[PDB]
Design a protein around this ligand. Structure first.
Ligand SMILES: *[C@@H]1O[C@H](CO)[C@@H](O)[C@H](O)[C@H]1NC(C)=O
Ligand SMILES: *[C@@H]1O[C@H](CO)[C@@H](O)[C@H](O)[C@H]1NC(C)=O
Lengths: 108, 107, 191, 194
């Protein structure tokens, strides 16, 4: 099992950005992919998750209206798109797996 | 238990023609445990299809499986001389059970 | 004198595969068992070593709530002294088991039309599991003398398969949500 | 619309030996199963293939109330797919059993101070019992190549032994009254409901 994300992104405010999250080793539509945000000097902050079978995304409060989880099952690739970038959205963004509610957040 | 009913008991066709062997299960059954085997006169059986539609390695394209639920069919697209043998089907719950066998001979 | 969070285990929206089974620890709370028992929505509710209607008047130092999803034909294996792929290679109860097992049909919640391959079971292992053992190992299983080194092929298979749960499956082949309550110093779980 | 005689089985003054178990045949009556399980008088009330609370809302063609006496240690064996001397040589439940097993301690009723040897089990038999087989044959068990001809001695023993129930026995060595309710099916018409 492996997760490899895309490269760093510099953008102006109001721009947009799309991060990718390739996987390898297992069956991509078997498990859930969720996203976590770590701003400078803050803790981890859970953003949400997308069902890899049905496509149904779930956004925790605060990441609604400008963030889009998406998938491309042709390349086992998760993506994170942010519209209308603000200065405060500056952070590290992690994609991560969920074996189960138990094995939740095992691979990063 | 699971009980398997092959039809017909004896299927007669000439070389070239297409063979449709039937296997019938006494109750609803998972397509993930159903295999087909070939037995030439005096030889140990050969695994042909496993799961429900997957060719075991070494088995040519002319063989092809199908089915779900309670009816499943082995299909030999174009018969060849070495395909005239008896064919059995397997299902499996707590333990394996087989079918009665279909003899395939020259018409 | 807080209540026990059973509703968080049973009524949980999603469960875990049987090979990576869940274990919730219950302590410092009160529990009404016959309310779960009078619920009459379960297909199996069988205890061992004690009675379901006498449960309310008892205490234990700790109670463990184990939950997973198996297949209708395999519920019979979640019992002491049982054999099979689930009993041997996924979840085993000790012969001196003194708890309860609970299950109900969950075809409505856990089966997708194309196929819900989210739930998995262990199929290939070299020896049975100890009582209450948990094996999450995904090492390639070696059936031949030649070793595998994380490469599938002949004599080298993935030790895990997926349940194929479709709504049109046979009842025995449908998914059943299972919960196990183990019973076990001063006591903190009473009624 | 008559009520079932479950009281006649459960509340019966004297029970049977386990090798010679009873089959009261229940037919043509209404059964309130929920009256039985909320009794909370049983140390074992473990069904299989059906839910105790959902039982009231059901019907069957024939209900078979099997009842016998064993020790508490052996109560575990009154289950599908068990081994042991009771499960193998006295009373065997099928691996497709679909009924209930009910048990309660009977040391007050079924134990005498000097020792009550009325109850018995089968200790020697050449092969396991078929499901729901009753074996009442008292034939001298042959252990050697030399036949017995109804004369005890070496390699020739009485097939039956006696439970030794004393009020001072260990709780597992104490008597437990068992009632086994076996449920059939439809196709044929039903006679027992709730
Ligand atoms: C699950 O939810 C239903 C509906 O609210 C409720 O009736 C039931 O008691 C709940 N189960 C548990 C174990 O709390
Ligand atoms: C046995 O007798 C007691 C005392 O009358 C009664 O409460 C109980 O219900 C009876 N049991 C059955 C199975 O009828």
């Amino acid at each position: 099992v492996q997760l490899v994300q895309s490269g760093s992104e510099l953008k102006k405010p109001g721009a947009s950005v799309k991060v990718s999250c390739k996987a390898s080793g297992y069956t991509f539509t078997t498990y859930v992919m969720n996203w976590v945000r770590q701003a400078p000097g803050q803790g981890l902050e859970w953003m949400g998750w997308i069902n890899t079978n049905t496509g149904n995304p779930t956004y925790a409060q605060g990441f609604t209206g400008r963030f889009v989880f998406s998938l491309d099952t042709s390349v086992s690739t998760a993506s994170l798109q942010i519209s209308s970038l603000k200065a405060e959205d500056t952070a590290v963004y992690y994609c991560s797996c969920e074996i189960t509610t138990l094995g939740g957040m095992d691979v990063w | 238990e699971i009980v398997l009913t092959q039809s017909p008991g004896t299927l007669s066709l000439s070389p070239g023609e297409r063979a449709t062997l039937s296997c019938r299960a006494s109750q609803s059954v998972s397509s993930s445990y159903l295999a087909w085997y070939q037995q030439k006169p005096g030889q140990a059986p050969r695994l042909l299809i496993y799961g429900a539609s997957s060719r075991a390695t070494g088995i040519p394209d002319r063989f092809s499986g199908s089915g779900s639920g309670t009816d499943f069919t082995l299909t030999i697209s174009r018969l060849e001389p070495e395909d005239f043998a008896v064919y059995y089907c397997q299902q499996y719950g707590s333990s394996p059970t087989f079918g009665q066998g279909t003899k395939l001979e020259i018409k | 004198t807080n209540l026990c969070p059973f509703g968080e285990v049973f009524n949980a929206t999603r469960f875990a595969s049987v090979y990576a089974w869940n274990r919730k620890r219950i302590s410092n709370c009160v529990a009404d068992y016959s309310v779960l028992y009078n619920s009459a929505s379960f297909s199996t509710f069988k205890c061992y070593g004690v009675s379901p209607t006498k449960l309310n008047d008892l205490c234990f130092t700790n109670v463990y709530a184990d939950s997973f999803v198996i297949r209708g034909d395999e519920v019979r294996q979640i019992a002491p002294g049982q054999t099979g792929k689930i009993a041997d290679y996924n979840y085993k109860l000790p012969d001196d088991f003194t708890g309860c097992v609970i299950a109900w049909n969950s075809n409505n919640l856990d089966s997708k039309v194309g196929g819900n391959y989210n739930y998995l079971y262990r199929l290939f292992r070299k020896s049975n599991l100890k009582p209450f053992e948990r094996d999450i190992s995904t090492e390639i299983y070696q059936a031949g003398s030649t070793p595998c080194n994380g490469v599938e092929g002949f004599n080298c298979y993935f030790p895990l398969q997926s349940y194929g749960f479709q709504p049109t499956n046979g009842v025995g082949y449908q998914p059943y949500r299972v919960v196990v309550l183990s019973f076990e110093a001063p006591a903190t779980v009473c009624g």
